[PDB]
């Protein structure tokens, strides 16, 4: 294809690392939105095979090695040591733009499952704003679906193909390490989670009909995928999800099997210093946690599930490109 560029709304005076990187690598956004309609054009898309995702992945990796430097980095046999200062870290939206001679096509089917032919298409200079939010299991601070829940997969038969659940209805998750210096928790409205998993099981049933739907905690792996992991304000949170991906859906009803309390699920989390890298196969060691109350109040906007009568799904992730895919699913670059 071609090298795209990034337009951000970032601020040169911000110390925050996303802002620095973007002012150093992205052009300013166009306030005037260049957009063409053309319903009839009938392009095909395949979110699973989309050079845009690669380019963004590249960039985010660059941004992380520039901003979130680890005290140590073990890759292969080598151990590189850098200064690993604490930093101001809040992901900002990024727009991916097509350079002169190329344009981005945008699929407008509010229910597009991200592969195949798309009726209502548009021409755009740039993607919407996308926050590069690295995480497993739970997709955070993404952009909602429009009409109903969508279920995206390269191939649902193949149970080794990550499944992306695109929710239409954000679900609050609040994580705090309050003022063991490494212990924190996450709170979720069990009624909200309730509804969401029930609705998700419905939609999942449409794709496996004679089967009862099951949600079970992550079976095994590196700690970074068997828990909901993510970076908040700098530190690396790992949160246990077993009280969350824990329920059955049978006969149009969803029962939650995980344990709650006064109608909220709380997740035990630990802040980890040693970190299995998502960028490449290796480890990164970071300084002990900063002090004071570390809190991220985020929207669960999507899931990352893997499947194994009864059909049962567990939370997955680990290929940070799936996060990008979940937002970029609806575009392709052309010409």
Ligand X SMILES: N=C(N)NC[C@H]1Cc2cc(CN3CCC[C@@H]3CO)ccc2[C@@H]1NC(=O)C(=O)Nc1ccc(Cl)c(F)c1
Which parts of this chain interact with ligand NAG (CB under 6 A)? Answer: 90-91, 113, 115-116, 133, 140-141, 144, 148-149, 153, 155-158, 168-170, 189-192, 194, 199, 202-203, 216-217, 223, 226-227, 230, 232, 240, 242-243, 246, 254-260, 263-264, 296-299
- Residue 299 · residue 17 · CB < 8 Å: no
Instruction: Pick one of ligand NAG, ligand X, none as the site partner of residue 275 (Cβ within 5 to 8 A by kind).
Output: ligand X
Among 190, 224, 235, 327, binds ligand X (CB under 6 A): 224
Continuous H helices in 17-94:
17-25, 51-67
Residue 87 touching ligand X (CB under 6 A): no
Alpha-carbon Rg of the chain, whole angstroms? 20
- What is the token pair recorded at 233? 């304000």
CB of 102 to ligand X, least distance (A): 30
Instruction: Pick one of ligand NAG, ligand X, none as the site partner of residue 224 (Cβ within 5 to 8 A by kind).
Output: ligand X
C-alpha to C-alpha distances, 274 to 175, 215, 237, 283, 284, nearest whole angstrom = 20, 29, 11, 7, 6
Instruction: Pick one of ligand NAG, ligand X, none as the site partner of residue 136 (Cβ within 5 to 8 A by kind).
Output: ligand X
Residues facing residue 314 across a β-bridge = 306
Burial of 175 (0-12, 13-18, 19+ CB in 10 A): buried
Instruction: Pick one of ligand NAG, ligand X, none as the site partner of residue 243 (Cβ within 5 to 8 A by kind).
Output: ligand NAG
CB of 224 to ligand X, least distance (A): 3
Name the nearest CA neighbour of 127 among 282, 325, 306: 325
Burial of 81 (0-12, 13-18, 19+ CB in 10 A): exposed
Shorter beta-carbon distance to ligand NAG: residue 148 or 291? 148
Shorter beta-carbon distance to ligand NAG: residue 16 or 319? 16
- DSSP states of 207-230: HS-SSEEEE----SS-HHHHSEEE
Continuous H helices in 212-330:
223-226, 321-328
Shorter beta-carbon distance to ligand NAG: residue 98 or 112? 112
Binding mask 19-58 for ligand X (x = CB under 6 A): ----------------------------------------
Shorter beta-carbon distance to ligand X: residue 9 or 216? 216
Shorter beta-carbon distance to ligand NAG: residue 223 or 285? 223
Shorter beta-carbon distance to ligand X: residue 29 or 240? 240
Q: Tokens 């992205």 sit at which residue? A: 26
- Residue 69 · residue 287 · CB < 8 Å: no
CB of 303 to ligand NAG, least distance (A): 13
Say what angle helices 51-67 and 321-328 make with each other, to 10 degrees.
130
Instruction: Pick one of ligand X, ligand NAG, none as the site partner of residue 157 (Cβ within 5 to 8 A by kind).
Output: ligand NAG
Interface ranges with ligand X (CB under 6 A) = 134-136, 222, 224-225, 229-231, 236, 275-278, 281-282, 318-319
């Amino acid at each position: 294809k071609t090298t795209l560029f990034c337009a951000s709304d970032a601020k040169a005076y911000e110390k925050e690392v996303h802002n620095v990187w973007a002012t150093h690598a992205c052009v300013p956004t166009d306030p005037n939105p260049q957009e063409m309609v053309l319903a009839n054009v009938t392009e095909n898309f395949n979110m699973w095979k989309n050079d845009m995702v690669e380019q963004m992945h590249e960039d985010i990796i660059s941004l992380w090695d520039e901003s979130l430097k680890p005290c140590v980095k073990l890759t292969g046999g080598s151990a590189i040591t850098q200064a690993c200062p604490k930093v101001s870290f809040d992901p900002i939206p990024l727009h991916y733009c097509a350079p002169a001679g190329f344009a981005i096509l945008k699929c407008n089917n509010k229910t597009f499952n991200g592969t195949g032919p798309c009726r209502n298409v548009s021409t755009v200079q740039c993607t919407h704003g996308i926050k590069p939010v690295v995480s497993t299991q739970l997709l955070l601070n993404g952009s909602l679906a429009e009409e109903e829940i969508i279920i995206r997969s390269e191939n649902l038969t193949n149970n080794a193909k990550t499944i992306i659940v695109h929710l239409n209805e954000s679900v609050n998750i609040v994580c705090t390490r309050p003022n063991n210096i490494r212990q924190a928790h996450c709170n979720i409205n069990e009624s909200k989670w309730n509804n969401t998993l029930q609705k998700v099981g419905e939609e999942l049933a449409k794709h496996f009909p004679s089967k009862t739907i099951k949600f079970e905690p992550s079976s095994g792996g590196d700690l970074e995928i068997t828990t909901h992991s993510f970076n908040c304000r700098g530190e690396f949170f790992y949160c246990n999800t077993s009280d969350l991906f824990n329920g059955t859906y049978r006969n149009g009803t969803y029962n939650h099997t995980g344990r709650s309390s006064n109608g909220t699920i709380t997740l035990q989390c630990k802040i980890k210093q040693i970190i299995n890298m998502w960028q490449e196969v290796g480890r990164a060691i970071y300084a002990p946690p900063i002090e004071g109350e570390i809190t991220c109040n985020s929207n669960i906007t999507g899931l990352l599930l893997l499947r194994d009568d009864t059909e049962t799904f567990r939370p997955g992730g680990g290929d940070m490109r799936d996060n990008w895919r979940s937002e970029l699913y609806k575009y392709k670059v052309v010409e």
